[PDB]
C-alpha positions as a printed Julia matrix, in Angstrom:
125×3 Matrix{Float64}:
   0.39  -3.88  13.23
  -2.55  -4.23  10.89
  -1.83  -5.79   7.5
  -3.17  -3.41   4.89
  -1.11  -2.05   1.96
  -0.92   1.61   0.93
  -2.59   1.77  -2.41
  -4.81  -1.35  -2.14
  -7.87  -1.13  -4.6
 -10.24  -2.3   -1.93
  -8.76  -0.25   0.96
 -11.95   1.48   1.79
 -13.89  -1.71   2.77
 -11.1   -2.84   4.91
 -10.76   0.4    6.9
 -14.49   0.58   7.28
 -14.18  -2.0   10.08
 -11.38  -0.11  11.78
 -11.76   1.9   14.97
  -9.3    4.55  16.21
  -6.68   2.25  17.92
  -6.99  -0.13  14.94
  -6.28   2.79  12.59
  -3.28   3.4   14.88
  -2.03   0.03  13.74
  -1.63   0.89  10.14
   1.77   0.99   8.33
   1.04   4.49   6.91
  -0.7    7.77   7.33
  -4.43   7.9    7.66
  -6.78  10.88   7.95
 -10.61  10.69   7.58
 -12.19  13.94   6.46
 -15.79  15.12   6.07
 -16.98  16.86   2.86
 -15.85  20.16   4.09
 -12.38  19.1    5.23
 -12.73  18.69   8.97
 -10.7   15.98  10.61
 -12.78  13.07  12.09
 -10.07  10.42  12.37
  -6.16  10.73  12.5
  -3.66   7.92  13.17
  -0.39   7.8   14.98
   1.51   7.23  11.8
   0.45  10.65  10.48
   1.48  12.0   13.84
   4.92  10.39  13.39
   5.25  11.67   9.84
   4.18  15.37  10.55
   4.68  16.27  14.23
   1.05  16.54  15.03
  -0.76  15.18  18.01
  -3.58  12.96  16.78
  -6.11  13.69  19.49
  -5.69  17.54  19.3
  -6.16  17.89  15.54
  -9.55  16.1   15.44
 -12.14  18.71  14.86
 -10.01  21.27  13.0
  -9.99  21.79   9.29
  -7.15  20.29   7.37
  -7.02  22.83   4.64
  -7.89  26.05   6.62
  -6.35  25.47  10.1
  -3.91  22.47  10.01
  -2.1   22.22   6.66
  -2.33  25.44   4.41
   0.3   24.17   1.88
  -2.42  21.73   0.66
  -4.73  24.72   0.3
  -3.91  24.93  -3.43
  -5.28  23.6   -6.78
  -2.9   20.65  -6.81
  -4.33  19.23  -3.5
  -7.45  20.99  -1.95
  -8.75  21.64  -5.37
  -8.54  17.87  -5.91
 -10.48  17.14  -2.78
 -13.19  19.73  -3.48
 -13.94  18.15  -7.06
 -14.15  14.72  -5.47
 -16.68  15.56  -2.83
 -18.8   17.55  -5.32
 -18.82  14.77  -7.98
 -19.19  12.15  -5.26
 -16.07  10.16  -6.17
 -12.4   10.61  -5.56
  -9.52   8.22  -6.14
  -6.26   9.93  -6.91
  -2.57   9.4   -6.07
   0.34  11.96  -6.13
   3.59  13.12  -4.56
   3.76  16.33  -2.56
   5.86  18.19  -0.09
   4.39  19.18   3.31
   6.3   22.26   4.62
   4.24  24.13   7.13
   5.85  24.57  10.46
   8.02  21.51   9.75
  11.07  20.21   8.02
   9.91  19.66   4.45
   8.85  16.09   3.94
   7.96  14.69   0.5
   5.22  12.16   0.77
   3.03  10.02  -1.42
  -0.51  11.04  -1.08
  -3.67   9.06  -1.78
  -7.13  10.55  -1.53
  -9.99   8.14  -1.87
 -13.75   8.22  -0.94
 -14.64   6.0    2.04
 -17.53   3.44   1.82
 -19.43   5.49   4.45
 -21.81   8.18   3.32
 -19.93  11.4    3.06
 -16.55  10.6    4.42
 -13.19  10.72   2.64
  -9.81   9.23   3.18
  -6.39  10.83   3.07
  -3.47   8.34   3.14
   0.2    9.22   3.18
   3.71   7.71   3.39
   7.21   8.9    2.89
   9.0    8.84  -0.44
């Protein structure tokens, strides 16, 4: 298990060093997303939380294909402002309900160190 805390101010430097099986060590959900919303990385914890198979969802689009309930102004809309402005750090609660038992989570979107990448982190509430 890799010792990083959900919500750490410097999270993005830390994860920068982390490869896929290292990201599978985290204590929480972790998705890395391009500027358009396509899934580049996806850890086991998010698999555990949502039912999804990590390796299959890489390549698909989070908002269009994977998770339509986040296609809304309260979530996607947040993401799209971020990417456009070139900065995103926000935290909120939300309920994922698509093709699953509804699960309330805490959600943290934050811009990765790397060029045009963006992090989506998640844990149960």
